[model samples]
Target: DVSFRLSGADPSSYGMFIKDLRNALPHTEKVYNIPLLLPSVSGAGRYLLMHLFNYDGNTITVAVDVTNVYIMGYLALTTSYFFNEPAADLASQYVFRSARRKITLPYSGNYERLQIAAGKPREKIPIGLPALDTAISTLLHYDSTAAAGALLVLIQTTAEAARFKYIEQQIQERAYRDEVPSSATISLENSWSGLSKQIQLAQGNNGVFRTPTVLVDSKGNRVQITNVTSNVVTSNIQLLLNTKNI
Candidate 1:
């Protein structure tokens, strides 16, 4: 009996929802789409929030709906008003909060972190979307148009959320190197040098050495040294004579 109007996903198969929309404005004269830009959010891919307006002799009513042609199904990643207005102030606030917090993320690999922070020429860094999203939600307010607008800027802040994973990897690597006291060329050199000095002393009979032995029945009547007996025997008798003189 009246003009039918609808928007979002598929209009033919989902005409029922559009029918409901039409029923809301009983005196609808015509229906048309309004151009609007929708932001990328969690499960929802990039889409335009189809703004449908029912016009009847100067009386206008609007209904907002999400597009079905999305990367994923609808999730509350953005609000309806985000299309109409640019929340520049909110964007600035998001940047400030992100900079101050600087939350780190647990990525798949340390190499992945490196790629994201400082990749080779023309290489794209992996996007840690979920982690960045979670951090934004936790550290700052979510479900906001300003927050959504700001997120775009926040991603560009070089040292912001994008590089958090890389920074975390570097810090952890440093801590591990500090804790283990290994991995450095100097450490390995010192270890080999110390070992070489000990070997020289033992070979020249300049120091006392002990071999593992078992005393038979605890009375010291029988003695048997382990496998090192031949190896520990000195080749230089002069050093042994010098030891005897001392």
Candidate 2:
């Protein structure tokens, strides 16, 4: 890993330097961010956001094994702009902080893999994203990746429990027939001398007047209208109160 300061140069020149560095070490990854206020720095400055071994490539080890330009570039910038410390002492601070802060979130890669696999139907099964957001907001309280890595498994289990609660709701809706009837009988009457009309009263394969239905009479009684006698749409009209209900 090479470490060289980009001194007394235009801040805009870092990306250009990285391009040349890439040509110099073709196998390494080089990236630059145009002037950024890197987290807790006193002022904004140009930064080589990434410059070192490729994380997605087949090589990885401790910081010392790689050029550590990944850690070094920011360290280099801080040294360049704010604190100009010796290279030898800076190495000690680098070793301690990286060792303490390095963390691998166990779910991130697999979470991405499963999310992509389930995406065809927009994960017809839902709520994982909300649970992830829950973890994200929850971690905002603790403020460290290592602390939140522990919190992730807890939230992930909650996502599974939430799905379990939801799936139970889907199957519990299996309905029985009679409670939800397909048709209803309606009766209508017009002005003061109005004749009553009954509508849509249905029959079973072998039925009608045999199991008479309740209807409104001229007197507005709830009566069984059966085989004919009035108006011989016909039968003897029986009596009932409007009590069969409105």
Candidate 3:
């Protein structure tokens, strides 16, 4: 009889993937859900892994990570046999190696060289596959425990955009302004100050006149202004207004 055990995940989030998971293991002798007691991963709730070990001698593992805006799934291992103890020996097996090397994903956007080393807030930044792959490479900085633990960190880091943002009310210490070139003043505008800088820049450089295209708030800061709608996006309580009379 084969058994499926799920742990290290919140049912609310994993419930969404129920369909895919069931399909992955079509034949199940017994299914079990275990409490995630004493998770070794730093960010406990953001990761999930599934394992199947059958009496007939087949073992498989899957890695999954979820952020508010993204979901990452990796096929961690598939092998001809299942072992009850000492997972160390499985390291030398070819099956695990094949899964690990498939990490290089395809290009979906300009994710290879965004210089996120010093990037800014842009809440609207799309979570493209290439961007996810880029994050995987950097956060390469885990087993199924080693691998799943790390993949969760990578997905959360990329989707949260916690550092690059500079909220007006909760400005982080790293928040700083960048001056827009004279020619690109109007390239894009959405902030009050961003607009003010553009108007001033139109007069040409006075040696003292300077304009900043970037602002202090964003999920991911842009090269230019934070956009007119960013402030609205971050509000905890939102209200809508409509004035249409015909």
Candidate 1, superposed: residue stretches over 4 Å from native: 1-81, 85-126, 129-132, 135-246
- Candidate 2 C-alpha lDDT tens digits along 20-73: 333232222111111111122211111122222221221122121112111221
Expressed as tens digits, the lDDT of each residue in 23-132 for candidate 1 is 33212111111111122222212222222222211111111212211111111222211221122222222222323232122221122232332332111212222222
Which candidate would rank higher by TM-score, 2 or 3?
3
Report the C-alpha displacement of residue 36, candidate 1, in angstroms.
Answer: 21
Candidate 3, which segments miss by more than 4 Å at Cα? 1-15, 18-37, 41-47, 50-96, 100-122, 126-246
Q: Which candidate order results from sorting by lDDT in descending order?
A: 3, 2, 1
Model 1 lDDT at residue 54: 20
lDDT of 3 by residue, 77-120 (tens): 33222122222122223223454344332211122222131242
What would the TM-scores of all predictions be? 0.14, 0.16, 0.19
Query: Which structure among the candidates has the greatest TM-score?
Result: 3
Residue 28 Cα positional deviation in candidate 3, in Å, after optimal superposition: 24
Give residue 72's lDDT in candidate 2 (0 to 100).
Answer: 20
lDDT of 1 at 22: 26
Ordered list by TM-score, greatest first? 3, 2, 1
**CA displacement after TM-score superposition, residue 64 of candidate 1 (Å):** 9.8
